[PDB]
Inverse folding.
């Protein structure tokens, strides 16, 4: 249907060339961007602009073009929006007017001219110089949820709002580092290719190094090397880097995502809760100018202090079941069968409690909530709670029914840590193939002495979704993993 | 080595618990860093301190200890330095003093006490409260790049100069993003898992996605996806991220390294030259306080503007062979034989010229130098020079004999880009297993139109090696890839 349409364009290219101009342009000096023009000359009168001859120079893509004859208009779009340009043969000459006439929607051009207003009052640029910058061999679509991610470049051109989202994303990450850097946290870079994939319960992407003939695993967490830094005496460190998990895609999951991992010597999980809430309220204030944001049909208030609720209590409140009493694994399995909570063959009281939470409770936590007291069985890298060792001084931040962060009072006792790992291995022989793996090197590190520490993990992408009211993670990732 | 010392520390742990103490501590609130205490109170005499009775709280690892019966001293080290603590049973009580007595070198403790100077004059802290915070089961290093790289934590604790290097690295990167952002370049995040390993000439790490059953390649460059963003109308983008290349290690290369990639629509490689020198000059100025630096035996002057030299003129200056001469591939092969320049079967004029440069010229370029005009055969993503099509508008930045950047006037003409890819595939046929691979998606992207663009790539690790006078990249990477 539109196969020679591409040939129509492939022809104007030949014509443009033989017309003596580089169809793919040279450098172009600009003076402003569309948005600056309106903010600087949007309120000036038509005749005072005509008098002032304010010369500008801009560049962009042709989104709309109209008017035949010896004069025409077109809307040029740059990163900040669109601005109308007006080209008259009796102004730019014949060669340039010809360049304007052959120009296609989608083609990129640069112009020099003066500000002025049409009778209808639109602010525009009276072109006195029309430069051809780039020929588009394929036309613009016209003005598909999944076709937007498959060709993000087309999306960014056609939907202004998407652009805003990604800009907002850059501001969020930038705001995060300014806060952390100013509070003494050292931004560092640790390995992404590991001998042993530790720091979480997750399946890894496996690769191989040819020269060193080594099997390397892409990191499923940043935790283990950062901890080595704490043993290293660095005290405060953070890292915002990519993490990789051989998992299937979700509305809130992507194989490679961005996580913030930070550790603070001499702090515990309650300290981290405060850090977490201040950090996020800060970012919201700095970037959006407020702590009250919309997400779905919810108005989420990020103003500290946020609710602290123990996982076991959350379960009593939303389910009506108690896990505070001493309980046998058998009794936990009964309560599970009764409430329709699924359990794995390797699960025990601890795992079951968490299943009760994740399956019957979490989705209902809308306002920022610090869920704490995660059972020790599912927290192999966290310190046991003193008063009741069945649970740990760990917490997960929940907002709009999903986890935005994971943190704990770190386990620096190396003997206990080794014991957690063996238990993890036992769980594996029992069906759990996400059980953590023994890392002697890491354990060796703890053996030189890691001070008491508080660690924090934050899903940056998810935070971005929250602050941009994005229903899917693929709306906040420039090139989400495609099924292909 | 410490067969029993281990038994002794191990058994010591048990004794701390009997004292009723958590051998791995709780959180501890500090008031200052050791260094701040010297900067604030070092000038005050012994009695001035006695009058002002300055209460403080510090924490650190025990570096030295002296036990004089019922009172002793110890030097504890925090991230900023050491401070001496004076612990007398008369003040802290018998219980706490037994904790002090049993404390081993390497153990971490925190104290609260007042500032004061001993008869000798060393600023100290007369402790009123001694808190055991962590037991080191192994004794710190007794003293080879081995443990420094394999056990970086020990290095960071025992060698302050290594610690500063990593602190300076955080500053260099922080400084870089400062310039870029304030100059309008948008920081973004693009995929590290690619369907096609393109954007560079390198052998990648291959991996597999289970759920989607798909072969993925770890990025060998960030280029392609960033250019899709320029097509997207983002105009000015940058990404400081990890890049992976399945190549052997050396003092100049690590399999996973940090590269800065940035693109600017409407600019060309000359514009990029100016940016590169301003950026680097900015970082050095802001971090070292000067652009005049020392690297090894060299006194390198980073003050712009830097020397501009065409690769061909460089070969003429440093070797004597003039490649401006139109010659056949065979004559170039003959010239290669006569000057001891090794070539490969797939090579023609263009490749040979570059080998003359890398083999015979590179190492002689000490002062910052912009080498430009790379032959087209090795520049598949760079636009060809208008005057002499054998070369492209591209440059590499050489300093102290090594490459620190690669950049060019981007090839935005899709017909020509396709042609280059075909040439590369052809080379791979002839044995060049580092030839760029085809990426239809990228070609489709350029087909929608990409403005003339200026692209740049800087090896961040190498820039930091330069600014910290680190002879090896393994000195600016917290945990470098080690040999099996
Ligand atoms: N030492 C304290 C804990 C630090 C973090 C820990 N090392 C870790 O690996 N945690 O993993 P998670 O708790 O599963 O991840 C933390 C956050 O990252 C986000 N996240 C996790 N997995 C994905 C994913 N696959 N895709 C996108 N986002 C993800 C989410 O917000 C989650 O709460
Ligand atoms: N579009 C303009 C060019 C952008 C960069 C281009 N896409 C690219 O891939 N370049 O690759 P190189 O030029 O080989 O690398 C750029 C810089 O990275 C550094 N580098 C390259 N490989 C390693 C390495 N293996 N280890 C440490 N640093 C490295 C070095 O400074 C080098 O000059
Ligand atoms: Mg979580
Ligand atoms: Mg290079």
């Amino acid at each position: 249907e539109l196969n020679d349409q591409l040939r129509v364009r492939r022809e104007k290219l030949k014509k443009i060339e033989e017309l003596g101009v580089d169809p793919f342009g040279k450098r172009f000096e600009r003076t402003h961007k569309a948005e600056e023009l309106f903010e600087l000359y949007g309120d000036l009168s038509k005749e005072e602009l005509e008098e002032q001859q304010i010369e500008v120079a801009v560049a962009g893509r042709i989104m709309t073009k109209r008017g035949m004859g010896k004069a025409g208009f077109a809307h040029i779009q740059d990163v900040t929006g669109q601005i109308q340009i007006y080209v008259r043969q009796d102004d730019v000459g014949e060669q340039q007017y010809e360049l304007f006439k052959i120009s296609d929607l989608g083609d990129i051009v640069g112009v020099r001219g003066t500000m002025f207003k049409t009778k209808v009052g639109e602010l525009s640029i009276k072109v006195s110089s029309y430069e051809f910058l780039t020929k588009a061999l394929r036309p613009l679509p016209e003005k598909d949820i999944e076709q937007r991610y498959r060709q993000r470049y087309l999306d960014l051109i056609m939907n202004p709002e998407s652009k805003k989202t990604f800009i907002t994303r850059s501001l969020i990450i930038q705001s995060m580092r300014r806060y952390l850097d100013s509070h003494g946290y050292l931004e560092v870079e640790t390995p992404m290719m590991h001998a042993v994939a530790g720091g979480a319960a997750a399946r890894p992407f496996i690769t191989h190094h040819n020269a060193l003939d080594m099997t390397l695993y892409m990191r499923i967490a940043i935790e283990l090397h950062l901890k080595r830094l704490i043993v290293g005496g660095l005290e405060k460190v953070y890292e915002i880097g990519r993490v990789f998990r051989n998992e299937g895609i979700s509305t809130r999951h992507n194989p490679e995502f961005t996580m913030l991992e930070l550790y603070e010597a001499y702090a515990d999980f309650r300290d981290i809760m405060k850090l977490t809430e201040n950090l996020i309220a800060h970012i919201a204030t700095e970037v959006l100018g407020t702590t009250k944001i919309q997400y779905g049909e919810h108005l989420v208030d990020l103003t500290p202090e946020w609710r602290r609720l123990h996982m076991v209590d959350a379960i009593k409140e939303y389910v009506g079941v108690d896990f505070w009493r001493q309980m046998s694994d058998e009794e936990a399995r009964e309560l599970a069968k009764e409430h329709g909570v699924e359990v794995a063959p390797h699960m025990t009281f601890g795992h079951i409690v968490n299943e009760f939470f994740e399956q019957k409770v979490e989705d209902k936590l809308i306002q920022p909530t610090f869920i704490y007291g995660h059972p020790v069985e599912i927290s192999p890298l966290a310190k046991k709670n003193p008063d009741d060792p069945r649970f740990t001084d760990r917490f997960e931040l929940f907002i709009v029914g999903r986890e935005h962060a994971n943190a704990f009072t770190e386990l620096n006792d190396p003997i206990d840590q080794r014991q957690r790992f063996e238990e993890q291995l036992k769980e594996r022989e029992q069906g759990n193939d996400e059980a953590h793996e023994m890392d002697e090197d890491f354990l060796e590190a703890l053996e030189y002495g890691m001070p008491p520490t508080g660690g924090l993990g934050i899903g940056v992408d998810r935070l971005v979704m929250l602050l941009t009211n994005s229903p899917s993670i693929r709306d906040v990732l420039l090139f989400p993993q495609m099924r292909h």
About this structure: Chain A touches chain B through 107 residues (CB under 8 Å). Residues 160-182 of chain A form the longest helix (23 residues).
